[PDB]
Amino acid sequence: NFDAERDALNIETAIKTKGVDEVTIVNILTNRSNAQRQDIAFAYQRRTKKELASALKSALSGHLETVILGLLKTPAQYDASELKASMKGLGTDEDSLIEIICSRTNQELQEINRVYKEMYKTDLEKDIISDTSGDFRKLMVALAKGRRAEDGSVIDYELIDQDARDLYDAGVKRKGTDVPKWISIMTERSVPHLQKVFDRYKSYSPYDMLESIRKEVKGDLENAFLNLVQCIQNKPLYFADRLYDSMKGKGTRDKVLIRIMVSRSEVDMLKIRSEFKRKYGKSLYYYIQQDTKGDYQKALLYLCGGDD
């Protein structure tokens, strides 16, 4: 059962069923890859004459709408749209903002940039500028460029030690504000490289990288750098934490959990589950199931993908 024509027919049926049949809509869409869902949208329009995203908007509501509409976007469109979303307000959610931009590669970031401009008729860099300020704007602008180095074949041990010390020297030896130095090293070196930088940093600081930050820069670049480093060091662990933080406490910050599950079900969902189990003892399946209800939850559970 990947047959677009049959998928589109079953969804048309399910959408025109008196009172909609969400069970079917969810069983189909959360069990097809992003590419497969694109062929279904196509075949659905071809078949019904209306766009599928449009048909589901009318058919669906609450959190399930949000989940299903997101899934229909290609990854770049999705990211593009969640960057718009999260940078509205003064430009509010600075966490969500790194979440989306840390954790994409240079090439995903060129697509995001290109599409963003297309959907919103304005460069991503301009809204970041509008919706952020101070050093956070300088950081986000530079990340969004997606200009990290790629990879030298042998591990470039030479440059690591230099960066390690330089981060320590700018951050906490000299210390006020050679924050530019932090911005550049954190944005222009490859992830693997920076992972090693974070290990060798321990040699220079009495604290590990994360501990060293706690107390430095306060201006969001404290909290923004705690997020970026976790994200570089260990993406699965990073999303696992953010997933848990969204589901902890009375109720749920359903934006973060939805975005993550939709955005990561095809990238590293298995490692995320793995890490989540070890760090909190319970599986991701379980907190979701518990913390969500209805067709909404089984849509997440399907995107979670497995009972652990």
From Swiss-Prot:
Annexin repeats lie at residues 2-73, 74-145, 158-230, 234-305. GO terms for molecular function: cadherin binding involved in cell-cell adhesion; calcium ion binding; calcium-dependent phospholipid binding; calcium-dependent protein binding; cytoskeletal protein binding; identical protein binding; phosphatidylinositol-4,5-bisphosphate binding; phosphatidylserine binding. The modification Phosphoserine is found at S153. Its main location: secreted. There is a cross-link at K18 (Glycyl lysine isopeptide (Lys-Gly) (interchain with G-Cter in SUMO2)). InterPro entries: Annexin, Annexin_repeat, Annexin_repeat_CS, Annexin_sf, ANX2. It is linked to Increased expression of ANXA2 is associated with hepatocellular carcinoma tumor progression. This is Annexin A2. It comes from Homo sapiens (Human). The gene is ANXA2.
